[PDB]
Design an enzyme around this catalytic site. Structure first.
Site, short mmCIF file in Angstrom:
data_model
loop_
_atom_site.label_atom_id
_atom_site.label_comp_id
_atom_site.label_asym_id
_atom_site.label_seq_id
_atom_site.Cartn_x
_atom_site.Cartn_y
_atom_site.Cartn_z
N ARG A 197 38.64 35.07 33.95
CA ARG A 197 38.99 36.18 34.82
C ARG A 197 38.02 37.25 34.92
O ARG A 197 37.98 37.87 36.11
CB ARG A 197 40.48 36.60 34.54
CG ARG A 197 41.83 35.48 34.67
CD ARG A 197 42.61 35.52 33.74
NE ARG A 197 43.86 35.78 33.86
CZ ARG A 197 44.54 36.43 34.84
NH1 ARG A 197 43.85 37.16 35.52
NH2 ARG A 197 45.68 36.45 34.91
N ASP A 212 47.71 33.58 47.50
CA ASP A 212 46.37 34.38 48.40
C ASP A 212 45.39 33.63 48.97
O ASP A 212 45.54 32.47 48.80
CB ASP A 212 46.12 35.63 47.32
CG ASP A 212 45.67 34.90 46.03
OD1 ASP A 212 44.78 33.88 45.94
OD2 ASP A 212 46.09 35.43 44.94
N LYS A 242 47.74 39.12 52.10
CA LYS A 242 47.77 40.44 51.58
C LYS A 242 46.90 41.45 52.58
O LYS A 242 45.86 40.64 53.03
CB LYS A 242 47.53 40.91 50.38
CG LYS A 242 46.70 41.95 49.82
CD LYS A 242 45.20 42.09 49.40
CE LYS A 242 44.43 43.35 49.86
NZ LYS A 242 42.93 42.89 49.47
N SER A 249 49.89 33.71 34.39
CA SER A 249 50.09 34.51 33.11
C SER A 249 51.26 35.14 33.05
O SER A 249 52.08 34.86 32.39
CB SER A 249 48.73 35.52 33.06
OG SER A 249 47.61 35.06 32.79
N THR A 250 51.39 36.48 33.74
CA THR A 250 52.63 37.04 33.70
C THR A 250 53.60 36.52 34.75
O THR A 250 54.65 36.33 34.28
CB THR A 250 52.25 38.69 34.03
OG1 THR A 250 51.97 38.81 35.51
CG2 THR A 250 51.34 39.31 33.04
N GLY A 263 53.39 37.43 38.09
CA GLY A 263 53.49 38.55 39.11
C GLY A 263 53.12 38.01 40.44
O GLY A 263 53.99 38.38 41.38
N1 LIG Z 1 42.55 37.88 30.67
C1 LIG Z 1 42.91 38.71 31.74
N2 LIG Z 1 44.32 39.16 32.08
C2 LIG Z 1 44.79 39.90 33.15
N3 LIG Z 1 43.72 40.60 33.90
C3 LIG Z 1 42.28 40.20 33.64
C4 LIG Z 1 41.98 39.38 32.80
N4 LIG Z 1 40.46 39.38 32.83
C5 LIG Z 1 40.13 40.04 33.85
N5 LIG Z 1 41.32 40.72 34.42
C6 LIG Z 1 41.16 41.51 35.65
O1 LIG Z 1 41.74 40.80 36.97
C7 LIG Z 1 41.02 41.47 38.15
C8 LIG Z 1 40.68 40.27 38.76
O2 LIG Z 1 41.89 39.69 39.42
P1 LIG Z 1 42.09 38.25 39.40
O3 LIG Z 1 40.56 37.59 38.61
O4 LIG Z 1 42.30 37.62 40.68
O5 LIG Z 1 43.29 38.00 38.51
C9 LIG Z 1 39.55 42.05 37.49
O6 LIG Z 1 39.89 43.56 37.97
C10 LIG Z 1 39.82 42.13 36.05
O7 LIG Z 1 39.58 43.08 35.37
#
Ligand SMILES: Nc1ncnc2c1ncn2[C@@H]1O[C@H](COP(=O)(O)O)[C@@H](O)[C@H]1O
Ligand SMILES: Nc1ncnc2c1ncn2[C@@H]1O[C@H](COP(=O)(O)O)[C@@H](O)[C@H]1O
Lengths: 278, 278
Positions: free
Chosen positions: A93, A165, A188, A207-208, A210
């Site tokens: 991510r 999305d 969005k 993950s969550t 959401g």
């Molecule tokens: N392991 C993780 N869990 C949750 N959010 C993350 C993680 N790694 C990166 N992100 C954040 O998720 C955002 C990118 O959104 P997405 O990759 O679409 O979930 C970035 O601003 C990252 O800082």
């Protein structure tokens, strides 16, 4: 050729052994009282070509370090070629610097795998496949779309495939087109005849939960007869499983890139998809 | 020159800032719901020489991966030189292949630090200093013997300094000689006038406390008036603290290469010793 199963295979090493008819060697691994990892590669390998299976689901850091250790050991033991099959690659991510001075985690992880001796890297649904350009060796990306399509068709009568999305659109489309289903995506910013249909929301990771919850709303408020949720990597975190049942997600579909449960969850063994891509 | 404090400094970054009068920049770090680490280096560094403080005590794997991430970020942000001050270096006990096909963990860790951009590595009481030859950059080993000597002298009236094995002899001798105390070592296989003296058993690391417990026996069965235990790295594991009180170890002396408690434990801040060695 031989298959070496790391400390974190989810049966993938064993079923890849059957499918490919290659011998299976399991890495010896324990945890010291310290907390540290013990790693031993129990065979001869002198000039073998190796298929290492190590996924990096929770705990990501230990599984990563175990991956690094196993990999160097294998190269040290003479192996002719190292192929690292890491079903779920951690720190995916983290694609870029979203703010200045943030770490590009995936860059570091990938660079570390070239050093350490991985020749070929095999990954299932990398969050964003440009990521993997950082890795210097040979890349084999695996999109298990046909297996997800097949499963949806067995379980869902009259499927509409909904992507949460624009990110998930390509994946929805390729899955829906193989099963000749209708598909759309949520927009969005500030088709749609999913009215009365059995909707399936598909994402790479959950993950969550959401994004999937917000998407389950629109679906029901558009006449969804039912909502099912599907992802390649089901990293259900804390609430997740319950937070989803509450908004009325009946069924959950995931794969064995991760470790899970079975009140549900429909788990696809993606070894077959990985084997093709070898 | 500036000091960057990682996710795991034990005050060492802050006190090194005072001692050296160098500005202190703290790394922003959090844990995603995933379990994964977030890492951001919050200043400009363009052409600065950096002193990174990251210890790798429990959890070793996360702290190591955080170290890797922070390190590359720093090199990526322009820094002129990276000096990694890692008070406790994890995977140190894994010096060689004790059985065939075991991983030489410390080799992998060290190689990873060269890649990733660490120029100079600073370590306090490495389990065995030959280990660090694997690291390609510049080495600065720190033996905080004077600070341990000073503390023993404050707290122990009539000290005898006992090393649990021949491994710990050099360290016991250098500490005892500075304080003009008598010293000896226990001889595994199948001076000694510690009769009536206040014994201090010194080792590099104390984990389970097994070696220290067997040594506390010989001491009391040789007339020890009291037994105190001291180590640079106090990784007290599970029983440890209690397992020692039971055999009658009154006092425990450690340092802040690790994180600890204070029913006891006498904690020496070894920043002063690290500063000299810079
Ligand atoms: N392991 C993780 N869990 C949750 N959010 C993350 C993680 N790694 C990166 N992100 C954040 O998720 C955002 C990118 O959104 P997405 O990759 O679409 O979930 C970035 O601003 C990252 O800082
Ligand atoms: N983190 C650790 N905790 C406990 N024992 C270890 C650890 N790392 C390595 N060892 C073992 O300890 C032995 C070496 O003894 P020593 O280094 O004197 O404690 C080797 O056989 C290693 O396999």
């Amino acid at each position: 050729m031989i298959i070496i199963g790391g400390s974190a295979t989810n049966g993938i090493d064993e079923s890849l052994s059957k499918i490919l008819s290659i011998p299976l060697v399991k890495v010896e691994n324990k945890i010291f009282p310290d907390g540290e990892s013990y790693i031993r590669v129990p065979s001869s390998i002198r000039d073998e070509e190796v298929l290492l299976v190590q996924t990096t689901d929770y705990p990501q850091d230990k599984h990563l370090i175990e991956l690094f250790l196993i990999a160097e050991t294998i190269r040290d033991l003479g192996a002719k070629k190292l192929t690292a099959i890491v079903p779920y690659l951690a720190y995916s991510r983290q694609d870029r610097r979203f703010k200045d001075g943030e770490a590009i985690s995936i860059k570091t992880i990938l660079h570390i795998l070239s050093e350490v001796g991985v020749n070929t890297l095999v990954v299932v649904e990398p969050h964003k496949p440009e990521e993997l350009s950082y890795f210097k060796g040979e890349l084999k990306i695996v999109h298990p779309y046909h297996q997800i399509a097949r499963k949806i068709k067995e379980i869902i009568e009259d499927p509409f495939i909904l992507a949460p999305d624009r990110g998930a659109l390509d994946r929805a489309r390729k899955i829906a087109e193989e099963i000749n289903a209708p598909y759309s995506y949520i927009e969005k910013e500030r088709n749609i005849n999913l009215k009365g249909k059995d909707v399936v929301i598909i994402d790479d990771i959950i993950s969550t939960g959401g994004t999937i919850v917000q998407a389950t709303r629109l679906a029901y408020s558009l006449g969804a007869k039912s909502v099912t949720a599907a992802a390649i990597h089901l990293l259900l975190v804390g609430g997740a499983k319950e937070r989803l049942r509450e908004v009325g997600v009946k069924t959950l579909i995931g794969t064995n890139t991760i470790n899970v449960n079975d009140k549900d969850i429909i788990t696809i063994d993606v070894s077959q998809s990985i084997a093709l891509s070898l």
